[PDB]
């Protein structure tokens, strides 16, 4: 049903940022869009496109699960901008800028 599209593999990582190596040539990534990095079979590390290069490489901003990133991990692409949940249901909450709630003690924008 839902097959994720891959664009390349992780080439390098410098702390918070990364560089992608594209798999094929006819593949094309957009700009400012979110990518995903299969840090594990279970979890996903969101990201964002900040550069594109004549070599096809992609300068990437990482946003989650950076410590689980390596070199050679499969990299997927949503083909959509970064979005977050929005609505009155969010009032009264602390929230990661990715929309994830920070514990204490439908729509997308």
């Amino acid at each position: 049903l839902e097959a994720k599209q891959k664009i390349g593999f992780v080439h390098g990582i410098d702390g918070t940022i990364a560089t992608i190596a594209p798999a094929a040539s006819k593949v094309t990534v957009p700009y400012n869009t979110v990518l995903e990095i299969a840090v594990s079979a279970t979890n996903i590390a969101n990201a964002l496109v900040f550069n594109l290069e004549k070599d096809g490489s992609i300068g990437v901003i990482l946003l989650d699960n950076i410590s689980e990133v390596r070199s050679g991990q499969d990299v997927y692409a949503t083909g959509s901008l970064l979005k977050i949940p929005v609505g009155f249901h969010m009032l009264g909450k602390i929230i990661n800028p990715l929309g994830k709630e920070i514990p204490t003690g439908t729509k997308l924008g």
Binding site: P22, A24, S25, K26, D55, G56
Partner: protein, 138 residues
């Protein structure tokens, strides 16, 4: 040792030629496009030859260890099973120090061949062991 047919292509210009595909990368696009030139012109489109060499090279790498850069590619008993043009380009890569970029060459040469033959490949991984019923479904 290297034949003059290869040297004519090498000393000449080849990157500006028309190819089956426009190829992304830095220098290694030439490591692959030059193989395509050899396979197209002198070997008469016997592409799989070089694709076999990569396989051969893998078996050689494991037996020679990681420091196979330091040894020369032509004079060696291990490399005798390889093609002269494959050896030629490994010499060129050794000169440029880009021997750590080899996988990015085979991953490109296969694209050129797969678009010339027009054979896009697909990779499946099913279990510790294949199951025929699943295969028919798959």
């Amino acid at each position: 040792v290297p034949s003059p047919k290869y040297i004519e292509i090498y000393q000449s210009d080849f990157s500006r030629n028309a190819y089956p595909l426009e190829l992304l990368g830095g220098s290694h696009v030439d490591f692959a496009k030059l193989l395509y030139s050899f396979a197209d012109q002198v070997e008469n489109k016997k592409f799989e030859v070089y694709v076999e060499d990569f396989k051969k090279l893998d078996s050689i790498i494991a037996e020679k260890g990681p420091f196979w850069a330091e040894e020369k590619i032509f004079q060696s008993p291990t490399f005798q099973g390889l093609s002269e043009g494959f050896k030629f380009i490994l010499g060129w890569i050794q000169s440029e120090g880009a021997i750590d970029r080899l996988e990015n060459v085979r991953l490109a040469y296969k694209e050129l061949v797969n678009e010339a033959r027009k054979e896009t490949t697909a990779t499946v991984i099913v279990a510790k062991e294949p199951s025929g019923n699943d295969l028919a479904e798959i």
